[PDB]
Amino acid sequence: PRFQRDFVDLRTDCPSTHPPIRVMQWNILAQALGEGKDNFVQCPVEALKWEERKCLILEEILAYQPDILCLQEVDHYFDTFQPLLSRLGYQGTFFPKPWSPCLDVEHNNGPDGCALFFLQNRFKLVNSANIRLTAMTLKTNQVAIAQTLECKESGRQFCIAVTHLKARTGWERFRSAQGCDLLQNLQNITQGAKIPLIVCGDFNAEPTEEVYKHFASSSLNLNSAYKLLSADGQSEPPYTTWKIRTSGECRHTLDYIWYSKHALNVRSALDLLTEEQIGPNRLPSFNYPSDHLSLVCDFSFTE
Numbered sequence: 001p002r003f004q005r006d007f008v009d010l011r012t013d014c015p016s017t018h019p020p021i022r023v024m025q026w027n028i029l030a031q032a033l034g035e036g037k038d039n040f041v042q043c044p045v046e047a048l049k050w051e052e053r054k055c056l057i058l059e060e061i062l063a064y065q066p067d068i069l070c071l072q073e074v075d076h077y078f079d080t081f082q083p084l085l086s087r088l089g090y091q092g093t094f095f096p097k098p099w100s101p102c103l104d105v106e107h108n109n110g111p112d113g114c115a116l117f118f119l120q121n122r123f124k125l126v127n128s129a130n131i132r133l134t135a136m137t138l139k140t141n142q143v144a145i146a147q148t149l150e151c152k153e154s155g156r157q158f159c160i161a162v163t164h165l166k167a168r169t170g171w172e173r174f175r176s177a178q179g180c181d182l183l184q185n186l187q188n189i190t191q192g193a194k195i196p197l198i199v200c201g202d203f204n205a206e207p208t209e210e211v212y213k214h215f216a217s218s219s220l221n222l223n224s225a226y227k228l229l230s231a232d233g234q235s236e237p238p239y240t241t242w243k244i245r246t247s248g249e250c251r252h253t254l255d256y257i258w259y260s261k262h263a264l265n266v267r268s269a270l271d272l273l274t275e276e277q278i279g280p281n282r283l284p285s286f287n288y289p290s291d292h293l294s295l296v297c298d299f300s301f302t303e
């Protein structure tokens with residue numbers, strides 16, 4: 001089973017008063033893409049059944065109990081995730097790509113896109129922002145959702161954001177422009193970095209790309225939460241996705257959870273799977289519904 005990852009007690013060291021905020025980042029893998037476009041040559045097709053992956057994703061959410069849920073590649077929002085998660089208290093909003101590649105697949109379930117769930121009993125929605133990312137006025141196919149939430153017990157406001165940049169190789173400059181557009185939007189929505197901000201998303205980029213450099217050196221004072229897992233707390237994890245395609249076995253770190261370095265403490269982080277644990281055929285499989293591992297962290301304000 002995949003339920004073998006541990007939460008590492010982390011950096012805060014403060015006794016801090018308020019209850020933690022669970023934030024989950026995950027590329028749940030689209031069903032249309034997993035069947036048509038994705039080239040999982042080692043994964044059985046019976047493991048890729050929709051009714052099967054549907055339950056595993058639900059079991060993943062039930063296991064970690066997130067207060068906030070950021071998702072990429074959701075092509076079954078209205079079919080599955082919205083009515084079920086609302087029955088568990090989650091308020092959610094959906095924003096599909098204008099030209100999703102899922103439509104290229106024969107028996108597709110419509111467009112895929114970002115999704116943002118949050119416990120309605122824990123947070124009050126302040127403002128919405130469906131952002132179509134642009135590269136110097138050029139409307140891109142990619143999409144982001146920014147929202148301000150108020151803690152009903154504290155009154156502390158903060159912003160969460162979910163995105164999914166341009167995928168393949170040869171789009172580094174394109175992704176870099178996409179990231180800059182999102183940064184400019186978040187700088188406006190957070191009222192000039194006056195309110196804390198958390199950014200989840202499949203950036204489709206290694207830490208070496210310029211898009212990562214822009215986020216790491218942004219004036220929003222952001223930091224990658226999963227870096228704290230490393231020995232120095234300065235290194236991005238060795239992977240966030242691991243799969244074998246027609247091209248070959250692929251192991252990349254593309255998922256991130258950015259946060260206000262000055263206003264947010266990372267209480268914990270769900271550690272990764274070892275090679276012996278993930279199995280030889282890698283992700284996905286009978287025991288995991290996606291080629292991406294979910295990122296889960298506990299956040300907390302600095303007082």
Ligand SMILES: [Mg+2]
Nearest residue numbers: 027029030073
């Ligand atoms: Mg994918």
